[PDB]
Design a protein around this ligand. Structure first.
Ligand code: GSH
Ligand code: GSH
Lengths: 225, 219
């Protein structure tokens, strides 16, 4: 049976799975769950994923409720032996380490900021506080890239797919002027054909946030190529 | 060389790694990083881990900066063919999915609550708000346990090691009386020889939080 992806493309971790699906030409059925309309609290979706989060994948009997498990599962099933989720143990641990950085640090901080805008309205958010927390994530990713061309080594891996979507979301608000390696890496990701899967949801998230939060992102911040 | 574990046993993800190390008899060199003195910001540790977090594992040239990668790495290198990190793909993805639940949901929410204490003082924290967020996590784990004795199936896995330490930390503040499956699972986890690895750090966290929070946990 073909994988079923419950999704809202405004979500960065959803867009990471959409990028992998495009990169590998995976046939997947998409089922939209509108997060800003609260459809993730619908009783049948809650029964499927009590964390009420997207992406959720159903593939046969398997139900995955975290983008990072979804990326790993799809790579193992549709890129066997590939370099996205590498075969050598130490290389694979490095990718796993960076996936968890995305989950535990970069996404956590971007979610904290964006959730505050939705709950409080932009004018009531302590933007300076979130600028510090997210610039700290920029600094860390800049350090990762001072060693390798890609986040987890010399070539594109699942870590880049996970990180680039949330990075593009942070960068709607906060500029990358001071981060040359991060800008070089982001520019290169934007040249990838798979990056087309990030574009639509990023823009829909931009429009939704500006509406619900009653503000405008500074147009000069976002890196476009 | 033997793995090096940078740790502060007050950290629940540290304690998860300590439990696995004891369960598998792994010979490791422990290096204490006092989080309450800010030693995670010392220049050499920051150079090692820019996220300034424990646990951090150095194993040869490999540097891991997240407990969930460390658990998987140590299981793969020291417990090949074990049940903690199952070899069958569907079972392994199930364990991975629960490891990420611990990272993304349970630990996130407990960390939000504990950080609010250290920042604001216990007397100023919106306790009811965090009670709702953390009770929601209890409700989810209770459902995870409906058809299995452990978090990811009929056997103990890495998911149980990761979740039990944070669970015990949430349980400093919020009791398990209303969750029969979760309470029975936690009691069973406490019978493990390896659970002794959780005991010392949990009580150190209690004592440290209560002094800095100028409060006492209801437990
Ligand atoms: N760590 C999880 C994070 C998933 C997550 O929190 N998704 C957000 C959207 S970016 C969501 O579904 N929010 C809906 C809700 O929490 O109710 C993953 O990587 O999939
Ligand atoms: N997702 C990470 C979380 C690690 C983490 O946040 N550890 C806390 C202690 S519980 C820490 O080191 N805090 C110090 C700091 O953030 O400066 C993991 O599982 O290892």
């Amino acid at each position: 049976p073909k994988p079923i992806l419950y999704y809202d493309e405004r979500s960065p971790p959803v867009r990471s799975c959409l990028m992998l699906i495009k990169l590998l030409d995976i046939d997947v059925e998409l089922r939209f769950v509108n997060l800003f309309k609260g459809e993730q609290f619908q009783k049948d979706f809650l029964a499927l994923n009590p964390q009420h989060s997207v992406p959720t994948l159903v593939h046969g009997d398997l139900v995955l409720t975290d983008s990072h498990a979804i990326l790993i599962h799809l790579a193992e099933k549709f890129d066997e032996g590939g370099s996205l989720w590498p075969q050598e143990h130490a290389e694979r641990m490095k990718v796993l380490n960076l996936l968890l950085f995305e989950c535990s640090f970069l996404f956590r901080r971007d979610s904290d900021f964006m959730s505050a805008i939705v709950r409080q309205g932009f004018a009531n958010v302590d933007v300076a506080h979130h600028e510090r927390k997210l610039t700290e994530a920029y600094i860390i990713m800049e350090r990762y890239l001072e060693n390798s061309d890609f986040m987890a080594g010399p070539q594109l891996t699942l870590a880049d797919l996970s990180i680039v979507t949330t990075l593009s979301t942070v960068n709607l608000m906060f500029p990358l002027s001071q981060f040359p390696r991060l800008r070089r890496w982001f520019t290169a990701m934007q040249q990838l054909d798979a990056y087309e899967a990030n574009c639509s949801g990023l823009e829909k998230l931009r429009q939704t946030m500006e509406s619900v939060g009653s503000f405008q992102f500074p147009s000069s911040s976002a890196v476009v190529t």
